[PDB]
Amino acid sequence: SGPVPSRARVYTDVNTHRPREYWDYESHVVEWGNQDDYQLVRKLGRGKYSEVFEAINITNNEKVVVKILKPVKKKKIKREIKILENLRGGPNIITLADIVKDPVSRTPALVFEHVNNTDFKQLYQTLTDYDIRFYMYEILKALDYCHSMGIMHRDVKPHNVMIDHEHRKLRLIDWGLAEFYHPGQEYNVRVASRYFKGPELLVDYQMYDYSLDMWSLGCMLASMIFRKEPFFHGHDNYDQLVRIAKVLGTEDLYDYIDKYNIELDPRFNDILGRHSRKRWERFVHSENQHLVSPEALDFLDKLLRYDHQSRLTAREAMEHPYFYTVVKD
Numbered sequence: 604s605g606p607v608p609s610r611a612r613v614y615t616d617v618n619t620h621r622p623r624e625y626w627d628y629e630s631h632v633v634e635w636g637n638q639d640d641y642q643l644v645r646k647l648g649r650g651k652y653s654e655v656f657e658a659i660n661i662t663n664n665e666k667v668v669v670k671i672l673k674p675v676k677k678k679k680i681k682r683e684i685k686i687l688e689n690l691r692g693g694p695n696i697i698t699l700a701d702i703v704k705d706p707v708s709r710t711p712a713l714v715f716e717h718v719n720n721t722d723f724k725q726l727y728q729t730l731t732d733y734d735i736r737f738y739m740y741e742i743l744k745a746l747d748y749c750h751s752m753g754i755m756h757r758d759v760k761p762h763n764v765m766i767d768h769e770h771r772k773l774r775l776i777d778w779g780l781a782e783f784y785h786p787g788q789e790y791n792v793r794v795a796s797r798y799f800k801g802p803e804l805l806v807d808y809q810m811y812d813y814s815l816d817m818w819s820l821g822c823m824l825a826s827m828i829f830r831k832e833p834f835f836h837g838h839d840n841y842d843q844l845v846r847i848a849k850v851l852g853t854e855d856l857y858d859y860i861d862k863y864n865i866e867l868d869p870r871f872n873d874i875l876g877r878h879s880r881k882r883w884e885r886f887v888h889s890e891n892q893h894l895v896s897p898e899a900l901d902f903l904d905k906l907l908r909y910d911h912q913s914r915l916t917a918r919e920a921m922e923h924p925y926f927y928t929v930v931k932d
């Protein structure tokens with residue numbers, strides 16, 4: 604008595620009908636640029652997987668970002684490179700400008716375009732209703748494109764969305780966890796940041812798809828219109844799903860479990876408890892009302908759903924009324 608298999612309802616076989624070389628990244632033969640064309644300048648980020656630096660291309664005085672890949676299996680590096688290459692030129696997709704064998708760990712190093720980024724903890728406090736609609740629309744173009752190209756980002760979150768506010772410029776970065784969708788494949792549920800993780804990942808349902816990114820996006824939309832970052836703030840993976848059940852309610856949650864016949868950890872039993880589904884208006888107050896609207900609540904409602912097969916796709920989302928001031932302009 605195991606889980607019921609699932610399939611993306613859209614773009615289900617895009618990779619199945621593309622030449623093997625498109626998704627068989629392990630056979631990809633990298634063509635290298637010259638590492639002497641770049642001068643690192645300042646370190647910006649240090650995470651468990653990379654060292655990111657603001658840098659300068661000395662053949663044109665253009666700023667760029669260099670991500671040196673700490674040693675970590677040639678498969679992971681090839682996956683990201685192949686994906687970045689497949690998506691290059693996509694709408695709002697960060698541009699991979701060069702790839703070089705970096706002597707700083709003989710490791711490779713990816714050279715990305717620079718985005719004069721206003722940091723997410725300070726910007727969100729200053730955005731307007733129209734600004735959020737606009738940027739949500741831009742993020743959607745990137746996801747529908749990447750999904751339409753058989754690729755799940757799997758790490759959608761505010762750090763992974765660069766915004767050069769003064770130029771109304773948006774870029775979706777860090778495709779390090781991104782993967783190719785092949786119908787019926789069981790993936791690694793340990794992706795995405797805790798606060799943006801979808802129900803499927805939290806109950807250990809592996810045959811997920813593109814709709815994972817839609818949940819992450821819904822969590823971002825919620826944080827922005829209500830001005831609460833992160834919106835579902837759990838202590839750990841178990842508590843995270845509890846944070847979601849307190850808002851969406853346990854009823855629907857158990858209806859999801861039943862439909863896919865997912866055996867829940869017996870430790871989830873006592874801590875999920877029993878909660879009623881709350882109204883989005885309960886989170887509306889005087890510091891966030893000007894960013895909230897029926898369209899918004901309705902659009903958010905259609906993103907944050909337990910069943911991944913019921914969430915709106917990126918294309919459907921762009922058709923939402925929430926975006927006409929935007930799509931009209």
Ligand SMILES: Nc1nnc(-c2ccc(C(=O)O)cc2)s1
Pocket residue numbers: 655668670697715716717718719720765776777778779
């Ligand atoms: N200021 C910045 N401009 N681009 C940045 C950037 C782009 C991509 C990645 C990645 O890991 O893919 C990391 C940082 S950071």
